[PDB]
Amino acid sequence: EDPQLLVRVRGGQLRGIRLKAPGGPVSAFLGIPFAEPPVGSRRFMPPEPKRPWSGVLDATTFQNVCYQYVDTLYPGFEGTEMWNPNRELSEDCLYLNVWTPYPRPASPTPVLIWIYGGGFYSGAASLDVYDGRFLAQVEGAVLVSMNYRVGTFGFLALPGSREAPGNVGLLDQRLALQWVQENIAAFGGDPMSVTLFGESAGAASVGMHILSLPSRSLFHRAVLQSGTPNGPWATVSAGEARRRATLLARLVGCPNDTELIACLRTRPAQDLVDHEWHVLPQESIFRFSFVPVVDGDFLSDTPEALINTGDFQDLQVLVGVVKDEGSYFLVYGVPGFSKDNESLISRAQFLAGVRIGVPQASDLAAEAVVLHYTDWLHPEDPTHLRDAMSAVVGDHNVVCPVAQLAGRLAAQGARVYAYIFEHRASTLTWPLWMGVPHGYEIEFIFGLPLDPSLNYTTEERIFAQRLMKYWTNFARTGDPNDPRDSKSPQWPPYTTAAQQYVSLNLKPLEVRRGLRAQTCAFWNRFLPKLLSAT
Amino acid sequence: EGREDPQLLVRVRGGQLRGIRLKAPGGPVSAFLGIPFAEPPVGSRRFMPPEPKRPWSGVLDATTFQNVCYQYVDTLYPGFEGTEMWNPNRELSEDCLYLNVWTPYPRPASPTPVLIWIYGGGFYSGAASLDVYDGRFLAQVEGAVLVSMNYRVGTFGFLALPGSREAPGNVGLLDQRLALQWVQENIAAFGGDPMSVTLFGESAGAASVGMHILSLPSRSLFHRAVLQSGTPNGPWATVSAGEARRRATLLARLVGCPPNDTELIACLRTRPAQDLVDHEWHVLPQESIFRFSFVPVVDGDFLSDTPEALINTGDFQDLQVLVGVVKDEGSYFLVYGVPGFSKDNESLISRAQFLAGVRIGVPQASDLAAEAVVLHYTDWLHPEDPTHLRDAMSAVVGDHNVVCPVAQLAGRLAAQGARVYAYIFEHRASTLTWPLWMGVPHGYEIEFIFGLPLDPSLNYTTEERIFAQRLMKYWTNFARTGDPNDPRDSKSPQWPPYTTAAQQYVSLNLKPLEVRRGLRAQTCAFWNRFLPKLLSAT
């Protein structure tokens, strides 16, 4: 036996695996149970801490992926399959992973906790792009990722009930955060320096931990990559969650909350998944059926209310977006869009797309979107219309909620750093029109280009190394700038006055001002006044 | 006669005229000033359509400018050239229906294209006798026959009680039409081609030119048109029959006239001209800028429907139009009503002053519509910057009232068969006395088109004299051929026609022609497509 692979955590002993990273070994502890399997009577219920075990628990393999819908849009295509589960689907999925340097850090090391995305309906901490071996090896970081319940299983709520209260997927995350406080020092991690980081629904989850007091004592810093707690898709009202749960219950033949939930618990997992998509109020894109609910418990008020009134004085936040946030969403529901053609659309297809892309918009509000995004010099140009459609979806759902979050946190005492990731991976198999799509920065931050077998360019390996340094410098100090590098250009904090952000690309840092300032003034200030007054 | 200069004796349908040999920088010109074209619209004739001038006996002396139509005299900045250059330069009288004619000296042997000037001044002011409307340069240098007429302004020209016989409205436009009919009958007596008449005007003059395009009985009296910083469509050029009835009834009330239309109009006719002027400004529905009390009315007669309806449905196939704007259309309007603005300070305003200004600048806007304007014109990087706010305020007024109505007109005419040429005049006169922040204000291209820099006594630069010469060539080539380009000078940048596809227009400045695309395309999509929908719905 290897003493570097033997760890005693409060629940008992574990045996990890020595893994080979490009520059040397790492110790990986995969499939650690952090909760009692949320099966049977415990379906839809908050997680319970995992009971202690006997002997040495084998923590050398990733555990099951939470029950979720498997994407079959483009079957066998690397572009879609890379996001699809890579372990067996099971309701017994509440396990976490830990990567540490080999040997175990001599002094307490800053901890980075990854919370995956997938619209709160999908994802796993076991996907290749979330591999913590590089950050652990190269930057000496203790990296943790956990599985949390997604879909009906994690977010089906009958608000006010005790059996299905909602937000249980976020409670699974909170329990993995409590686990880290209690056990990370056994791995050489500093429980007093925990940075949460996530992308898309993961970033929204990070934001929801900022906005929920019981989570606030479990971390010190936060990274929100292409996602926010505020916005059109991250939350639903208690009413809308009640509507959706009652409809899915009807669809699966379930005729009192206790009675309804009891019946939902008798249904096989796949039956719930099979009907999940049928509860959305309109034909839409960037909208998910079971997402966090504004319950007045985990979320005391709507994220908008909480970000506008919160005190963020002793907080550091790294936020940002990718060049083309909304591009991939178009092939999943907008007529005229495909990965296999240049997707040059007509004006009619653009107006049609805006109603799907902004499903909550009135006729006047949709006209306001169309008139803002049209290039009145080339209003019929298919390339301009195709690119405008991507912008509507990315701006509405990601860029402008990020700009609003950065603005409110900065105004209310937080230390904020903002970025725009603009490098398209050389290895990308999605069409060129999709640009830098939502989620394709993750592989750089995690340092995948550093594996020569993955065939990224030399420039991409240097760029990934740079990104890993920003993220780990941020986790260490709350500032992404290298205290060693006495050379320019420094990454300035984002402020309400100067609105500074940086470009993350192959070229050195470039400081820009105003994150789509005019367009986001449209989404964040005008459009609410339009759906408000009428 | 017999001892007189034979080149100054001309007969017209009404009788004999004696003109005057004027001096232009490059030689003499013939001028026939103060020719009567109508029966004085006085007494019982006040508010009534003009009647053609009855013939006279003897030789009428046409050597001096005649009376300016009764109007409000501006006393904003008294003594200041900037305001006094626009103020009447002859006696104010209700007897003002006279026209002027400048022709080469000696008069052309062959029929010459005719240019007819229609002055601006919000339909409340103006005269064809102002120094900037001097036809002596265009006549001398370009051999043109230039005509300008006085038309009734204010209550006198545009007070209407729609449906009445006594005050039908648009009589100021009928005075213009009568001067157009006079040109058809008599211009050949001066060497002018009645078959090649180009109307040109600025501001309310340009709106009047547009109203002659949109009114069938005028269409047979001209062949081409120039609309400088003004249009028939837009927020200020017309009023509804209801709004005109409201305003006429209110002014009647204000001057002690109890409201029957016959009875009310009869009383208005007994009131001294100055009493009507003294109360003219008191009938505007809101605190506003770029809004005038008595303007053309959509009567279902001179204007068969609203100018918007007429420009959207009209066939403009055999029509050549030259349109354009100045760099800073709305700047001067700010000192005439927006708190925080003065010609005497740099006018750096606050956000509160900007929001306040938008309500004055867009008086017909709802709370939501005004918010849409504020959010569009704010620089979300520097939303408190006084220079940006001052400049945004000028842009709101200029765009709303001039730039975007011009863009809409150019678009509709081009789409419906017309040959449109569009420009942006960007040269600030070296002689300008308004502050630098005002840029190139509304009306300050006129002196260049008329060729005033050509007079050495006016102290313009050599570059400005070459530039004026260039402009006079564009306008007169346009009047001659319907194309501002010189077919001889093929090297010089070509002025392309404005089309709906390419949206081309040129920069008129000291530098050679530069072709640009889209006349403030995004912002005007806001004013012309969005904001009306913010009235059709909420």
Ligand SMILES: Nc1ccc2c(c1)c(-c1ccccc1)[n+](CCCCCc1cn(CCNc3c4c(nc5ccccc35)CCCC4)nn1)c1cc(N)ccc21
């Ligand atoms: N079977 C069924 C029945 C009914 C419906 C649907 C499916 C679907 C649907 C869902 C998923 C895949 C394909 C189709 N939608 C479409 C809505 C979901 C599309 C949004 C979406 C799809 N995905 C795929 C997840 N994988 C990705 C993820 C990321 N990046 C990616 C980049 C490229 C491609 C995939 C990526 C970053 C974060 C991790 C997840 N992520 N978000 C509906 C919308 C309605 N209005 C009504 C009914 C249905």
Ligand SMILES: Nc1ccc2c(c1)c(-c1ccccc1)[n+](CCCCCc1cn(CCNc3c4c(nc5ccccc35)CCCC4)nn1)c1cc(N)ccc21
């Ligand atoms: N006595 C009194 C009583 C009440 C009111 C007013 C006056 C005035 C007012 C009118 C003229 C000068 C000073 C003040 N306005 C303001 C009217 C705004 C008119 C804007 C305007 C002013 N002028 C002057 C005409 N001369 C000019 C002309 C042009 N350019 C110019 C450039 C700079 C300066 C003058 C120019 C283009 C050519 C035609 C005339 N032309 N348009 C009101 C607006 C209300 N809402 C209500 C009440 C009043």
Ligand SMILES: *[C@@H]1O[C@H](CO)[C@@H](O)[C@H](O)[C@H]1NC(C)=O
């Ligand atoms: C792209 O392909 C899909 C079918 O594969 C089709 O519906 C769509 O019209 C195509 N677009 C173009 C531009 O041909």
Ligand SMILES: *[C@@H]1O[C@H](CO)[C@@H](O)[C@H](O)[C@H]1NC(C)=O
């Ligand atoms: C890298 O390229 C080589 C061919 O040069 C190929 O054999 C290998 O499988 C590639 N790997 C990936 C992951 O693309």
Ligand SMILES: *[C@@H]1O[C@H](CO)[C@@H](O)[C@H](O)[C@H]1NC(C)=O
């Ligand atoms: C300009 O002067 C006027 C009064 O003459 C005043 O109302 C305005 O506030 C002043 N503006 C500035 C910028 O000083």
Ligand SMILES: *[C@@H]1O[C@H](CO)[C@@H](O)[C@H](O)[C@H]1NC(C)=O
């Ligand atoms: C022109 O300049 C002279 C000074 O050389 C001056 O006396 C005269 O008043 C000026 N006239 C005008 C119109 O500016």
